[PDB]
Design an enzyme around this catalytic site. Structure first.
Site, mmCIF file in Angstrom:
data_model
loop_
_atom_site.group_PDB
_atom_site.id
_atom_site.type_symbol
_atom_site.label_atom_id
_atom_site.label_comp_id
_atom_site.label_asym_id
_atom_site.label_seq_id
_atom_site.Cartn_x
_atom_site.Cartn_y
_atom_site.Cartn_z
ATOM 1 N N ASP B 45 0.904 -1.203 -0.109
ATOM 2 C CA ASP B 45 0.027 0.024 0.058
ATOM 3 C C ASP B 45 0.994 1.293 0.174
ATOM 4 O O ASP B 45 1.772 1.539 0.831
ATOM 5 C CB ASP B 45 -1.043 0.025 0.921
ATOM 6 C CG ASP B 45 -1.802 1.199 1.208
ATOM 7 O OD1 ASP B 45 -2.625 1.411 0.384
ATOM 8 O OD2 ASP B 45 -1.661 2.046 2.261
ATOM 9 N N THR B 78 -2.422 6.027 -3.976
ATOM 10 C CA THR B 78 -0.968 6.676 -3.700
ATOM 11 C C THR B 78 -0.102 6.459 -4.841
ATOM 12 O O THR B 78 0.701 7.442 -5.171
ATOM 13 C CB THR B 78 -0.852 6.263 -2.227
ATOM 14 O OG1 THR B 78 -1.596 6.734 -1.430
ATOM 15 C CG2 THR B 78 0.284 7.096 -2.193
ATOM 16 N N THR B 79 -0.032 5.176 -5.095
ATOM 17 C CA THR B 79 1.122 4.700 -6.271
ATOM 18 C C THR B 79 0.643 5.191 -7.357
ATOM 19 O O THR B 79 1.557 5.573 -8.402
ATOM 20 C CB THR B 79 1.634 3.321 -6.187
ATOM 21 O OG1 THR B 79 -0.014 2.515 -6.286
ATOM 22 C CG2 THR B 79 1.959 2.711 -4.649
ATOM 23 N N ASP B 362 -8.291 -2.397 2.088
ATOM 24 C CA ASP B 362 -8.256 -2.011 0.606
ATOM 25 C C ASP B 362 -9.193 -2.325 -0.058
ATOM 26 O O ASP B 362 -9.610 -1.615 -0.932
ATOM 27 C CB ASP B 362 -6.686 -2.632 0.328
ATOM 28 C CG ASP B 362 -5.502 -1.889 0.902
ATOM 29 O OD1 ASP B 362 -5.830 -0.540 1.455
ATOM 30 O OD2 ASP B 362 -4.315 -2.273 0.704
#
Lengths: 465, 497, 444, 479
Positions: B45, B78-79, B362
């Site tokens: 994550d 986020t990535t 998630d």
């Protein structure tokens, strides 16, 4: 690291292109170069800069050979071909970071160069050599970049009529070395004599007994020298010993044989071609079959020149080699005129080998970059991405022209892509009498594909002696 | 200065972004992280990895500031935003060298982002308006992608249904509002993941004090729910700034269990044992609010303010022993739909619990965006390729200086499919050019890079979908971040005293 | 920087235990700052846990070795070395072999299935003739006791561990066998006893022999057991009432009593090693045994404890799985053929990744021949030619130096042990191949 | 990995060559100056290696080998170090030929077992029933000690002491059960066996102490007689002892408090209970074995079943000695032990006399485990090399060359004996091998004899030592 060694040569090659980049165009920035001998020369010509730069880098010397072939083939674009070469080297830097082998990079340039020429021929307006009104306006605009302007009106038909006689049809390459510009002290610009047969560089005998004129003469080329049915003979100039003895002048005067001595060694190879004769080293091998054919040989001096002219060679193997005579008062006149008319012959030479002309000023480079960007989707794999980088590398030529002219860099480039969408080759340089032949834009891309190829193919260098 | 910081801000962003490039996608990297509180877990994550990264450069600190706010909205993107925002800065560096002001790049990406949104909506598909029978399979298979890189992938079929009910219960159909504070994520050591159950109420970690007290609460002859007592005052005789009188108020109100914030004496367990009234001790202030909301109770400040209407009513209260763990917690469920849902996961190791806990969290964020917008888009790289070809084609029609800002935005979107291609063992340039040819000469469709092993293109057959509101939220935060980075031309760092 | 430190740092971990693998292996010495704590032991788990390592990637193999030690307790060195050989070859697979790192991971996944299929086809068990199955337990016990000082008397110890497991007939739990270590006497004096020898006595002054005793863990009982101590007065009152009280019963002792009994026929107190012992007799279907080892010194007993506990843990798993395979370099040689067999049909990028796993399978027997004093490249290549085409029986011999059959020499291995090594070592290597960067938070 | 072993072999060879000069009584003495300023001088190999404080980890193993050399055989602590270094020096050329140390280590263990049977066939067979060779063995061994004429009477006292505890199949017997109590005064001619037990201290010298008791019980008691009215607290202590009729009290020596109060001396005087205080901690385990008693921490743990029996407990009157003796322990479960009292005028007498009796009891104990003796002076070292010369030709492979180098390393011991004596090294060794065609073990007429266990253990310990040295391929720091 065989590739990292090549990357060091690419950075060194792009540094040379950045130095020449400021000199592009008539508004470009001059470069000051101080030779080791102490001579100080300056000029905006990229061919003269790279010649006296004395580059010690092995790969960077390839730009000098390309610039030499650029002037020998097209005659124009020696500065732009260096900038175009550096653009492909900069675009290939990002390709090496993606894991792309330079062979695919070099092989894709072959298909990109051949495609760019075919696209350029579609927008090019085909012209014919039978129209003399197009050739006069083409050479007259090339003479507007020199101090001589109002006197260039009579110089336009001089260069046009000289090529049309030797053009014939399907001649392909036409060597301009056979066209000699004769520079003599005295006279004016408006005084010119074509003399299509041939023109020498030397005077006649000023001593007693010299006929200085002969009718129905045969002119041979003799490299020998007389020292302690041939009407006219040539003697090679040798400052070591005596060329022609004074007694030999009186001997050949009784035989009614015209003598012209002190022939320059540089013109020996030139006269052996246009005249269709052969050099005679020894009198034992000297025969009549090596002579020429001349109907009348006379010495006509406008003012102070005392020059001999020959007309009507009438040789089957040889062709009508024409030498242009240029007159002027000051030394700077016949000099600047020589380089101005030389560039005019190169522009005409481009139209003879390849018919058609385009409007200069970076106009075709914008549309070609637009068409190759849309056609890049038709390809697949690594080669498809190269078409996108190849189109962006072609935009450096019009961008540099906008930078060296004081105009805003990014603003003018955006105006080119906007106006070229609706119109075709309309932006207006045609109203400004700016015409760049298609062979210059074709050779600039062709020589750039071979120059960048010869660069990336070198993976290492070692001491060899 | 201008000639200095503008060049340094681009290199500073590439150093941090290049670390997570190999961590993108299910084939990415699971990084080992150690929290200062003593918790150890391994996950890919980006919100956790980027938060653990602490450096003194001010360019990368904006990534943590954006991911902190994005963690509440999505948290799984986020990535995707950092790599997309770094691609915009790479194309912005070339525009600066061409003589374009940095403020033009900020306004250039704004018009390019809004133009690409309308192009994606035209090619978008809807679920409820198309096939209702597959609405169940869409939510079950969406969590399988995120759970394929974890040990959960064996039992994933069971946890797929648990993540669906947890999101729907805390939301309304018309409002579509889901709060992370309403979803409690808890877990303990011992057992396996197959025994994990869904809890509709709070936990409190209570053993019911003395063991003789009943571990299960009976309805007591069809009463109304199960009444629980809430006390905001400690248990003690009143003193100026008694045990039999306070227990009578609970018996008259009908509260079976009493919940208080403060501890109890030993005599309290003696009197509450005879009446079968279990006690609750040491409840935090935040946990007191979740009890009254789920059980439909009220907050009673005083002792004599109790009543049957202010007592929270639940379905039942039972104590279920979990493995060999001596905690023996409680489970309070409800028949009606409540606003609080607590997820409970078990594992054989402490690292396994935290690995499956955040992996399940998630999945709750992915389903949260799927129910917010019924229209979904095909992911796996097909979204970035489709949106890039639309901007690149419309870039030639848009003239002016922004024409190059639109071309750079289309090339920046190609970074995502090329990054996933580098992690999947394929040519990033060859695959990108292949995806454009299938969507042009053949027909207009969505075909992305293959995250899982297969033998051909067209992942649309695999029914891999991504939420439209989730993908749209990523491009808006990446554009807003890229504009904010260009608004700082100077970095002022004071020394230490 | 991180990949170079993770690959080299993990090889240095395997280079420490490389001499501890095999019966011909060598002992590693460690020295602390005090210099008086130096101890000579070949235990792989002791070397990995004692040596501190600043490499974060090396700490992963330490925790994985702890999981392998809990299931069996042996073969932990072979797991670390095999995981190190996969990383040593991975350096050549990345740089010069042009292979994607995830492809290397997928290459070991397809190669692991071929290695497990080779062990399945080579697994042969005999249900009939239990005497032949008992001999297989003897040969397996000889390989577990290898590398340890017990190898001297191992010939006598072979029937000690084999006959002990046969007396269980039940759950694989090891709480039935209690190990008692007493100083004095040779190692060969150890015996097998099912009477549950207890190391603690009962009462101050009470009769030694007790008949018809009733064991009650805490009524009419003849024996009393308490976890805590006993006060003075009731200890005297219990004697007058005929109730014998037992003290100092820990949590481990209570769990062992729950697996036996309650009542017992005879409780006899014996004196061995200058300490009172209690040998129970006449239990109800006793499944528990007691092995009393007699060592020369405390250092010999401390090494014999975990040596016997790890040997009985493997023999306990042989009751559920009766299939056995030929070891001594033969097991790794058969799996090397299945890897090259499946390499006939394979993709371009996965070919060199799977073929590198085949050479890694031959690196384990290569080190086995190094510590044996023989030539690894000479002896393994001669065996590889015979195993190449058919007729696969014989395997590496660590004594004579020639090619001899493992069945004739009595060298066999359990099928459950090999499938656990190939599994855990493969999962241990996949974790380190994924990590190209390591970021550590600022400590406080 | 060879750089680690080669560095340890060279470091250990320098230590063995340093101790090599100390072999024999005429050998060179080594000096060690401690950091505290103390300087010791002696030829003992066990003392030098212990006080050297070797930082080399592998070289510290020689201390453990020398410790087991004196504990098992009792002699050859210097010779076992020389034999260890001889194999290490010969192993240097073995590694240069490409030989792995496993074959080197496995061949030494096989050569050590075959060397034992060679010595047993050439050894003279003797038995413990003949006291002629048992007295002459211990008498000639004391010629290197201060005792000369008095050593004749000390030999039969040590023989009869071992024959009682030797039995037949008992084999190894613990030497810690033999206690030698040295005390100033008296002489060497006065000796008492006292097979029951002997303490290390005197009795109560205060007033009222009986100092002698007949038919008393002896037991170990860790309690202490101290004040907390005080006579009433001490009365219950003496009353509980009277319940079990224990007339001999042994209190463990502790500097914390006193032993017996003076008020309790008058109480125990009427009961005729003898008290012996200042019992050392080393004697606590000793008295719990021979007497068959158990240490008693508290007064409630004190019982009658843990008390022994004593015929007569008396304090012998002697000059500056006053030794207490106990006879007739009368314990069937506990086996008897030998405790000999050593007396002498000078303190330097009773000191070396105790150490001289240690080497006398070890050599006699060597005959208990394995009977027979081999004449020293290099005879067993050369005799083994003579048999291995023809046997090396019967081997095959790499091991065939090891048998030749193994016999060459055995020649270092007889060579050092000739060097330390001033005689020519090679010349003396050649004279011994020249007469080997006629004589075999012939030193017999010089009354110089050596037990077989010393030569056997020296080869066994050195074979395992060098075996463990080559097993270390790396040196790491683990804390």
């Amino acid at each position: 690291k065989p590739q990292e060694v090549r990357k060091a040569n690419i950075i060194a090659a792009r540094s040379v292109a950045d130095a020449i980049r400021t000199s592009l165009g008539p508004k470009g920035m001059d470069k000051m170069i101080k030779t080791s001998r102490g001579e100080i020369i300056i000029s905006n010509d990229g061919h003269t800069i790279l010649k006296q730069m004395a580059i010690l880098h092995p790969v960077a010397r390839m730009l000098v050979e390309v610039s030499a072939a650029q002037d020998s083939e097209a005659g124009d674009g020696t500065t732009s071909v260096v900038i175009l070469t550096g653009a492909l080297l900069g675009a290939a830097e990002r390709l090496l970071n993606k894991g792309i082998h330079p062979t695919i990079i070099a092989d894709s340039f072959q298909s990109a160069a051949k495609r760019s020429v075919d696209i350029l021929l579609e927008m090019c307006h085909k012209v014919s050599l039978s129209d003399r009104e197009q050739l006069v306006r083409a050479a007259s605009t090339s003479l507007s970049s020199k101090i001589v302007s109002q006197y260039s009106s009579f110089l336009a038909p001089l260069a046009v009529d000289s090529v049309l006689k030797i053009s014939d049809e399907n001649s392909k390459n036409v060597d301009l070395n056979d066209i000699r510009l004769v520079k003599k002290v005295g006279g004016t610009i408006d005084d010119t004599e074509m003399i299509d047969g041939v023109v020498l560089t030397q005077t006649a005998i000023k001593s007693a007994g010299g006929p200085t004129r002969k009718e129905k003469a045969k002119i041979g080329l003799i490299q020998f020298q007389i020292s302690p049915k041939c009407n006219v003979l040539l003697i090679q100039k040798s400052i070591l010993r005596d060329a022609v003895n004074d007694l030999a002048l009186h001997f050949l005067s009784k035989l009614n044989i015209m003598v012209v001595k002190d022939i320059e060694r540089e013109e020996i190879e030139f006269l052996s071609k246009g005249l269709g004769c052969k050099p005679i080293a020894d009198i034992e091998l000297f025969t009549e079959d090596r002579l020429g054919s001349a109907d009348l040989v006379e010495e006509i001096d406008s003012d102070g020149s005392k020059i001999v002219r020959v007309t009507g060679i009438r040789n089957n193997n040889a062709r009508p080699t024409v030498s242009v005579v240029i007159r002027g008062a000051n030394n700077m006149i016949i000099d600047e005129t020589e380089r101005s008319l030389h560039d005019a012959l190169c522009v005409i030479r481009c139209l003879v080998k390849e018919r058609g002309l385009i409007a200069g000023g970076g106009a075709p480079e914008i549309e070609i970059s637009r068409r190759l960007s849309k056609e890049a989707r038709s390809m697949e794999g690594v080669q498809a991405f190269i078409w996108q980088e190849f189109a962006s590398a072609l935009e450096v030529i019009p961008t540099t022209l906008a930078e060296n002219a004081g105009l805003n860099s990014i603003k003018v480039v955006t105006e080119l892509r906007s106006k070229h969408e609706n119109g075709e080759l309309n932006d207006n340089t045609y109203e400004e009498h700016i015409l760049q032949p298609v062979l210059v834009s074709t050779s600039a891309i062709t020589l750039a594909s071979e120059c960048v190829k010869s660069i990336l193919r070198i993976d290492d260098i070692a001491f060899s002696r | 200065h201008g000639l200095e910081a503008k060049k340094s801000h681009i290199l500073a962003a590439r150093s941090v972004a290049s670390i997570i490039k190999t961590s993108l996608g299910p084939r990415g990297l699971d990084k080992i992280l150690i929290s200062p509180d003593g918790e150890i877990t391994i996950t890919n994550d980006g919100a956790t990895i980027l938060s653990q990264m602490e450096l003194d450069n001010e360019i990368a600190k904006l990534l943590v500031q954006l991911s902190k706010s994005q963690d509440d909205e999505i948290g799984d993107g986020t990535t995707g935003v950092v790599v997309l925002a770094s691609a915009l800065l790479d194309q912005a560096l070339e525009l600066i060298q061409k003589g374009i002001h940095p403020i033009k790049i900020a306004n250039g990406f704004d018009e390019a982002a809004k133009l690409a949104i309308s192009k994606l909506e035209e090619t978008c598909d809807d679920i409820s308006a198309s096939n209702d029978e597959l609405f169940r399979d869409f939510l079950l298979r969406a969590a399988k992608t995120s759970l394929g890189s974890k040990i959960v992938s064996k039992d994933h079929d069971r946890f797929a249904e648990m993540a669906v009910e947890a999101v729907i219960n805390v939301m309304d159909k018309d409002r579509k509002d889901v709060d992370f504070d309403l979803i409690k994520m808890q877990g303990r050591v011992g057992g396996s993941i197959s025994d994990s159950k869904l809890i509709n109420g709070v936990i409190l970690d209570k053993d019911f004090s003395h063991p003789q007290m009943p571990k299960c609460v009976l309805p007591k002859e069809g009463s109304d729910g199960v009444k629980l007592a809430i006390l905001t005052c400690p248990f003690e005789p009143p003193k100026p700034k008694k045990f039999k009188e306070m227990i009578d108020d609970v018996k008259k109100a009908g509260a079976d269990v009493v919940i208080c914030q403060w501890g109890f004496d030993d005599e309290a367990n003696h009197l509450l044992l005879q009446n079968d009234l279990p006690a609750v001790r040491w409840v935090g202030g935040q946990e007191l609010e979740h009890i009254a909301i789920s059980t439909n109770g009220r907050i009673v400040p005083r002792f004599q303010d109790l009543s049957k209407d202010k007592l929270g009513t639940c379905s039942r209260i039972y104590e279920q022993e979990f493995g060999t763990t001596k905690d023996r917690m409680l489970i309070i469920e409800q028949s009606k739909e409540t606003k609080t849902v607590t997820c409970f996961v078990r594992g054989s190791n402490k690292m396994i619990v935290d690995e499956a806990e955040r992996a399940l969290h998630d999945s709750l964020c992915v389903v949260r965006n799927l129910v917010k917008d019924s229209r979904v888009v095909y992911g796996g790289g097909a979204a970035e390729v489709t949106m890039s070809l639309a901007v690149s084609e419309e870039a030639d029609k848009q003239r002016g200086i922004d024409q190059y800002a639109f071309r750079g935005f289309a090339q920046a979107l190609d970074t995502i499919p090329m990054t996933l291609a580098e992690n999947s063992g394929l040519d990033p340039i060859g695959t990108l050019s292949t995806l454009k040819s299938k969507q042009l000469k053949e027909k207009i469709s969505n075909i992305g890079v293959d995250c899982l092993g297969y033998g051909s293109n067209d992942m649309k057959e695999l029914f891999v979908v991504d939420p439209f509101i989730g993908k749209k939220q990523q491009i808006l935060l990446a554009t807003q971040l890229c504009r904010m980075i260009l608004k700082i031309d100077n970095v002022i760092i004071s020394g230490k005293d | 920087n991180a990949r170079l430190s993770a690959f080299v740092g993990a090889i240095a971990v395997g280079d420490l235990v490389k001499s501890t693998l095999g019966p011909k292996g060598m002992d590693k010495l460690l020295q602390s700052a005090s210099s008086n704590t130096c101890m000579v032991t070949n235990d792989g788990a002791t070397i990995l846990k004692s040596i501190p390592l600043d490499n974060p990637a090396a700490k992963v193999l330490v925790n994985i070795s702890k999981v392998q030690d809990d299931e069996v307790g042996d073969g932990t060195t072979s797991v670390t070395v095999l995981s190190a050989e996969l990383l040593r070859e991975a350096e050549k697979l990345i740089d010069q072999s042009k292979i994607h790192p995830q492809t290397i991971i997928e290459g070991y996944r397809l190669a692991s299935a071929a290695a497990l299929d080779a062990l399945t086809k080579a697994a042969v068990d005999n249900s009939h003739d239990k005497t032949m199955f008992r001999e297989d337990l003897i040969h397996i016990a000889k390989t577990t006791l290898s590398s340890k000082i017990l190898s001297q008397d191992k010939d006598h110890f072979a029937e000690l561990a084999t006959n002990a497991i046969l007396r269980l007939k039940g759950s694989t739990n090891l709480e039935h066998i209690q190990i008692i270590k007493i100083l004095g006497g040779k190692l060969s004096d150890s015996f097998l006893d099912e009477g549950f020898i207890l190391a603690k006595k009962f009462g101050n002054n009470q009769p030694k022999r007790i008949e018809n005793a009733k064991i009650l863990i805490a009524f009419g009982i003849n024996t009393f057991i308490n976890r805590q101590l006993i006060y003075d007065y009731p200890e005297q009152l219990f004697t007058d009432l005929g109730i014998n009280s037992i003290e100092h019963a820990d949590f481990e002792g209570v769990e062992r009593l729950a697996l036996v009994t309650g009542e017992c026929d005879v409780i006899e107190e014996i004196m061995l090693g200058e300490q009172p012992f209690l040998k129970f007799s006449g239990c109800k279907a006793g499944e528990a045994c007691t092995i009393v080892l007699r060592g020369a010194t405390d250092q010999t007993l401390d090494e014999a404890e975990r040596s016997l506990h790890d040997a009985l843990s493997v023999l306990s798993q042989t009751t559920k799985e009766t299939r056995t395979v030929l070891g001594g370099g033969c097991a790794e040689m058969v799996m090397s053929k299945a890897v090259d067999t499946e390499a006939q049909n394979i993709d371009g990028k996965k070919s060199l990744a799977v073929e590198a796993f085949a050479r890694a399978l031959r690196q384990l027997p290569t080190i086995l021949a190094d510590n044996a004093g023989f030539d690894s490249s000479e002896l393994v290549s001669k065996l590889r030619s015979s195993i190449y085409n058919g007729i696969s029986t014989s395997g590496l011999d660590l004594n004579n130096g020639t090619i001899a059959d493992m069945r004739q020499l009595g060298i066999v291995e359990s099928y459950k042990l090999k499938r656990a090594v190939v599994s855990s070592a493969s999962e241990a290597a996949e974790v380190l191949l994924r990590v190209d960067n390591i970021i550590r938070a600022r400590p406080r």
